[PDB]
Each structure stands twice: as structure tokens, then as C-alpha cells.
Amino acid sequence: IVNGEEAVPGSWPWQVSLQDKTGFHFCGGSLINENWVVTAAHCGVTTSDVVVAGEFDQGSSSEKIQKLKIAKVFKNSKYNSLTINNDITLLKLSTAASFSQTVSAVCLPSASDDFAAGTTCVTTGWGLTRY
Amino acid sequence: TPDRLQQASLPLLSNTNCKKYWGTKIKDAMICAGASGVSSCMGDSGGPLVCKKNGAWTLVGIVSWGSSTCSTSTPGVYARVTALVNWVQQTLAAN
């Protein structure tokens, strides 16, 4: 996020971070309930990867975070790599997420759901803050 | 990459006015936003785009691509959840 502000901690409870076995954050993800994370298909997540939840400060050691293991990866079969069209991969968790004051689910819209141009919305993450 | 979690408010645009930018790169299953002075950027992918609807935050996009320079003047392109919820909804059933 270029120009974002720091979030209040635990204010975005469905935000998870995908990290490799190295510990390196490379994509975000959103908790859809306790066994299922949504992320991007281009993120190219495998099962040597992990779902970290309840994280605020990537650099803090004193955080009660949850390191969650991936069971199975579900790349939407209409995903198109040539276009990055339909860039949605579900993640099935081997380990249930323990919901709490800081770990929870976002809501999914109806296929029907309307969301109008001009409407102010919000995006979060741990991406480059200056490029 | 920042250590702690960032946030930004930003407006959604019509695909149509988006096409102004991405031309024929923008597919129905894609939803635009930004060009507001904020930008999503490398490392933010797979992450959340939320809108408030009737008390709750509802997944509206998934950070997918855009500018290679993370230009706050060009819109980011997100997955359009509306168009993939049927498939998600479905995947949940068989597992």
C-alpha cells in the first residue's frame, strides 16, 4: 500500500499472511471461516507454505499468532495465467483456526451483490509501502 | 515490506472507466479501485478488498495486479468476488 496508514491491531481479523518455510511474507489471504482461507491464484501457494493469523507486527516476537498448515490448494479452474483472469485460489487448512478477539471471518457477497462505482472501500496488507 | 499491517480507504470505479486505463486487459471477473492517491503494491496480493454492507465487511475484491511501479494515480485491479463466490460456495460443499 503506497500511502496507507498503520492499522489498529487486531482490527482486521480475517487478514492472514502467507509465508514460505523461510518466514518470508509474499502474499495476503482472508479467512472465510475456520478451515478456509481465500487468496489470489497467481500467489502460487503450495503446502510447504503457512497461513499466519492474528499478526499485526511482522517483526514482533511477543505476539500470540497462529501458524496454520495448508492441507490442499484449490486453484479456480477458470483462472487464466495468460490474463490473470479469475485469480482466486482457495486454501483448505490442515489445522483449524482458533477464532477469537483477533481471528475471524469476513463475509462473502451474494453472486447477486451490487457494489457501485464511487463507493469507498478498504484494502489492507503487508505489501511494499514505497516501491 | 512494512512490519505491521497497513490500511487504505479507496473508491471502486466502473470496469468501463477502468478500460480507460487497462484497455482490454480488464475481464468481467475483475474489479477496479484506487487512483485516489493510494495504491496496492507487491506483497499485497491475495489480500482483502472490503466494503461495508449492512453492518458487515464483505469480501468485494482480491488484490491481483496493476502498475509495476504501484502508481497511486492508476487504479489497482482486483479479483471480483461476485463472480467467483459461486465457485467458492461450491468448493465448500464437496470438502
Binding site: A7, V8, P9, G10, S11, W12, P13, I32, N33, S100, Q101, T102, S104, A105, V106, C107, L108, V122 | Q7, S9, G55, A56, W57, T58
Partner: peptide, 10 residues
Amino acid sequence: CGVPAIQPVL
């Protein structure tokens, strides 16, 4: 779903 235990500040 969707309503934090900790409310976000913008």
C-alpha cells in the same frame, strides 16, 4: 462474519 471484535479506525 464481518464485524471485528476490535473496531477499525479510519
